[PDB]
Design a protein around this ligand. Structure first.
Ligand code: A5F
Ligand code: ZN
Length: 301
């Protein structure tokens, strides 16, 4: 036993994770396997139902549609609704992993990232022999469209603010800083949500076909319909934060910076990432030779 500086290191899974579920939008039954991956692989989604297998790295450049969920595309092959799983992975510091899926949509589980964090954390994480690379924000980068707004600001840590503006009796602002807030405890359990009003339209378009009170906060004209209510008083805005954490992980590396979202969503989050990547003065890749002086820290593996 000796004392010295240690690099903050890349992580993969210690064991394989298998789950079965349903696609929120497609309603399809889907089998999910997460597997360990070598250093610098990133998170790569593998459609194992196809022959040959089609692999899509979870990066901003592969993002197709972003109307309802965050979708990845390569050719005519898609992987839908990647944000909640990706959010779980970013939240626990996973750099490298294969996500195999038997169908085009990640399973929705209970509508949050909780079950994923739980499955992953039961399997365990494996630190690997390479420095973890971070993306540090060095300038303000903002995108807007109409009243929607998404911003990166320099910040020595990682924090996220979000504000939504729904006119609905059921109601809007939250900030979370990973120096104090636990991702796992205060964010990961926040479920997706939908309004009864949109549901038939959505289904009329073959969207929300797997959605139910079992996997979503469902809201009618006046109230939450789920018999047992909300897991957090501000669950709705907490889920928007959960979504943003997963959409930001399409950078392919954790962030050192601050994100602020104002009625933001998947499209604008993706626009923001693209604008950031284009503006190489506004960011740089960094490592930390000494975890003790880093501005971020992680749970034991
Ligand atoms: C919140 C956000 C960002 N808009 C998005 N979620 C969705 O779009 C979405 C979520 C739930 C439903 C439903 C249902 C249902 C249902 C069945 C009718 C009730 C009966 O049992 C529909 C759409 C998201 O969290 N994306 O990541
Ligand atoms: Zn979501």
């Amino acid at each position: 036993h000796h004392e010295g500086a240690g690099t903050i290191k890349q992580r993969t899974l210690k064991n394989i994770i298998r789950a079965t579920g349903v696609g929120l939008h497609s309603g399809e039954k889907v089998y999910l396997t997460l597997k360990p991956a070598p250093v610098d692989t990133g998170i790569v989604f593998s459609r194992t139902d196809l022959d040959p297998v089609v692999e899509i790295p979870a990066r901003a450049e592969n993002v197709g549609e972003t109307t309802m969920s965050t979708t990845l595309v390569k050719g005519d092959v898609k992987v839908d609704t990647v944000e909640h799983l990706l959010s779980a992975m970013a939240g626990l510091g996973i750099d490298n992993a294969y996500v195999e899926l038997s169908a085009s949509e990640v399973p929705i589980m209970d509508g949050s990232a909780g079950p994923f964090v739980f499955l992953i954390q039961s399997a365990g994480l494996q630190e690997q022999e390479a420095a973890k690379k971070f993306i540090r924000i060095k300038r303000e980068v903002s995108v807007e469209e109409g009243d929607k707004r998404a911003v990166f600001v320099p910040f020595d840590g990682f924090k996220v603010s979000f504000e939504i503006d729904f006119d609905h009796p059921v109601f809007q602002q939250a900030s979370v800083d990973f120096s104090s807030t636990s991702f796992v405890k205060e964010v990961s359990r926040a479920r997706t949500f939908g309004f009864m009003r949109d549901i038939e339209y959505l289904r009329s378009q073959n969207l929300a076909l797997g959605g139910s009170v079992e996997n979503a906060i469902v809201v009618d004209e006046n109230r939450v319909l789920n018999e047992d209510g909300l897991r957090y008083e501000d669950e709705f805005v907490k889920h928007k934060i959960l979504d943003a954490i997963g959409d930001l992980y399409l950078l392919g590396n954790s962030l050192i910076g601050e994100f602020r979202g104002f009625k933001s969503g998947h499209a604008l989050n993706n626009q923001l990432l693209r604008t950031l990547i284009a503006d190489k003065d506004a960011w740089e890749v960094v490592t930390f030779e000494d975890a003790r002086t880093a501005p971020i820290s992680y749970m034991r593996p």
